[PDB]
Amino acid sequence: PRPRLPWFLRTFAVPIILAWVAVVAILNTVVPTLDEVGEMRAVSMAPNDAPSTLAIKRVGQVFEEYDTSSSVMIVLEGEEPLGIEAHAFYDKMVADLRADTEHVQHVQDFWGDTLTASGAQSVDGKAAYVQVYIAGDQGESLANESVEAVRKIATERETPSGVKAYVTGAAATSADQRAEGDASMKLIEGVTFAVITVMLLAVYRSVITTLIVLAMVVLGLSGARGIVAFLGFYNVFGLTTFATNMVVTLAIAAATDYAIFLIGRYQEARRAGEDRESAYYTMFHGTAHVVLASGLTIAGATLCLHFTRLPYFQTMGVPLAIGMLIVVAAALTAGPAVISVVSRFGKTLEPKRFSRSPGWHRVGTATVRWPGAILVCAVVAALIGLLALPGYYTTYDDRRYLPDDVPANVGYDAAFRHFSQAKMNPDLMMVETDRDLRNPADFLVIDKIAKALKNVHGIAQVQTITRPDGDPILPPEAFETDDFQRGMKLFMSPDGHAVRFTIIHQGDPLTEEGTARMDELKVAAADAIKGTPFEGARIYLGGSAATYNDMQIGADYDLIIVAASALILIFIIMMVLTRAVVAAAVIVGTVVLSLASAFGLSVLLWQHIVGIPLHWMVLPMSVIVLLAVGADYNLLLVSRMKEEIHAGIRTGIIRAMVGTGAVVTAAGLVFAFTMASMAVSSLITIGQVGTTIGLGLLFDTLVVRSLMTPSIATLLGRWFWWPQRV
């Protein structure tokens, strides 16, 4: 009277294993490697409706210069002040850049014209910079290719002695970030596998069992990689560095956890005295639903990213869910098949300890005897991490999160050695009318607008037609001058319908004060256009500061939406499986409390020890994984409690603690260490995400699963399983 599903998985184990291996091999061989697919299918990091991107694109369209939103700055640095040779080299480089229309779309030559030459040259005179609008939006593969082409054009040429060109900028930073993440993914995988091997040898103390678990992990990881790369290659969805790295790490960790659960339950059945066939059937009956529910929870939590606004999270959503589904399918079908096939030979999967752990029994007895005090202590420990909130802050520049030898970092270092960050991050503001503004009164009004913008606090320079370098030059004889005509061509649209101001903020515009300055600039422009024929003009404001403001707004909204959706979906899944509202609520609440400790530990590790503030993407990525895995562990505990409750509530809790003590502890340690192994990446954002998830899962395994959940269960008693009667 064996159930049909485990019987089928056991009788046809060899065909199932062969089919899984063949499918995974086909997926990997037919389509290129995941790194190449991610490079080809990289997506822009800014939403198409972002105000900054729209403003920059509108400026490009109006002036008939470009249709992109990505600009890289080429900085010429010299050991001696630049002169005739440097100018000739710069002119040749500009001509070559303009020749390559495939990648370069516009070159804002300001050092060339004597009208704005002083603006583009450093105070010491040993350096200069030129902005280049390149094809493709920041982040996508076309932008990376354009950055590489610009860098090749600038560096690979005959340069004057002591003069070097560096291609810095936000687009270059994103390209180098993607390159570093893709490069470090291999090292992440290697270190993760080494850590997993060490942990498995420690847990099982058997080389054969470790090899079996490693084989299952390799199968699951390879399947997830193959399907993700296959779908990405055929343009089903976009991919990012974070998406690929998290797919790989989560696949490895989830496969290892599922294998640990199955093998631990099988070995517990063996220790109970059941034969190998009966042990396998007991293992399946006791862990198949738990593994399926845990995988569905992880997949749904990851899929919740798909309903965000920022392109990175949204593009990360679907691939993670698909990969988790593949890992679960492999674990529930190839898992038991491998276990049966292996256990049919010698003393392979038979346990070596053949003894119980008095520590877990003692912990269970203590938790049952004194639930209130243990619960209070666990809650206090979880909420201690809230102390990191007052000191918590984030930065948006990615220079800190990349290695110094990175070309973008070298360019930024040279620029900051010779220029200020405000100049390297100018803010563009276009005022567009439906008439021609090439009349002296309109120029007076434009100068008034520029003065209004300068009056705003933290506004260092306002370059425009009336202020080519920020210093004002108005008879028509001024118009008759050729330099004024060139300035009009540079700062006004070909038809004269629009005028663009370049605003350099005092200090650093990439701050909260910078956002306030942006808002005040919009207000000042609106005030200036009042009462003038410019009243109907539309105002667009783009740049690095506006882009980072949009990123901040999107990050906040995405964090809120992701947290809410993940909580609701996980609660629904746990309610469906456990058939108890109170149990699911307890699981979700305990993991939510663990989240605060996770955040506190991560902030303490990175801000106050390493010295690098958490990236603006770490928390939304880490929240879903922490919630899913903590819910899975509490689900294991609750499921075993439901199985053992027939002997009594407290006796059932103690038996659940004993049975699922070592297995879930080993699984949690393995998952936490696999996540923490991402810290080896050169990209520091991925390391922060991995360390945050690892710390959170360590706290959940040590405190939440062991103490908080059993204490809450004991205190609730019969009400823990409401509404179903016990």
Numbering used by the authors: 22 to 494, 693 to 945
What do the authors of the reporting publication say about this deposited model?
The genome of Mtb encodes 13 mycobacterial membrane protein large (MmpL) transporters. These membrane proteins belong to a subfamily of the resistance-nodulation cell division (RND) superfamily of transporters and are critical for mycobacterial physiology and pathogenesis, with several of these transporters involved in the export of fatty acids and lipid components to the cell envelope. MmpL4 and MmpL5 share similar functions in siderophore export and are required for iron acquisition. Mycobacteria secrete mycobactin (Mbt) and carboxymycobactin (Cmb), siderophores with an extremely high affinity for Fe(III), via the MmpL4 and MmpL5 transporters to recruit this important metal that is essential for growth and survival. According to the protein sequence alignment with MmpL3, it is speculated that both MmpL4 and MmpL5 are proton motive force (PMF)-dependent transporters that function via a proton/substrate antiport mechanism.
The cryo-EM structure of MmpL5 embedded in LMNG detergent micelles was solved to a nominal resolution of 3.00 Å. The cryo-EM structure of MmpL5 is nearly identical to that of MmpL4. Superimposition of these 2 structures gives rise to an RMSD of 0.9 Å (for 681 Cα atoms). However, cryo-EM densities for the majority of residues making up the periplasmic subdomain PD3 are missing, similar to what was seen with MmpL4. Distinct from MmpL4, the structure of MmpL5 indicates that this transporter only possesses one channel that spans the outer leaflet of the transmembrane domain up through the periplasmic domain. However, the midway point of this channel is much narrower, suggesting that the structure of MmpL5 may depict a different intermediate state with respect to that of MmpL4. In MmpL5, the section of TM8 located at the outermost surface of the cytoplasmic membrane shifts into the core of the membrane protein by as much as 3.5 Å in relation to the position of TM8 in MmpL4. In MmpL5, the narrowest region of the channel is surrounded by residues Y417, Y767, Q771, and W835, residues that may be important for controlling the width of the MmpL5 channel. Similar to MmpL4, residue D278 and Y852 of MmpL5 interact with each other and create a hydrogen bond, presumably relaying protons for energy coupling. Autodock Vina suggests that MmpL5 binds Mbt in the transmembrane pocket and periplasmic cavity with affinities of −7.9 and −8.0 kcal/mol, which correspond to KDs of 1.6 and 1.3 μm, respectively.
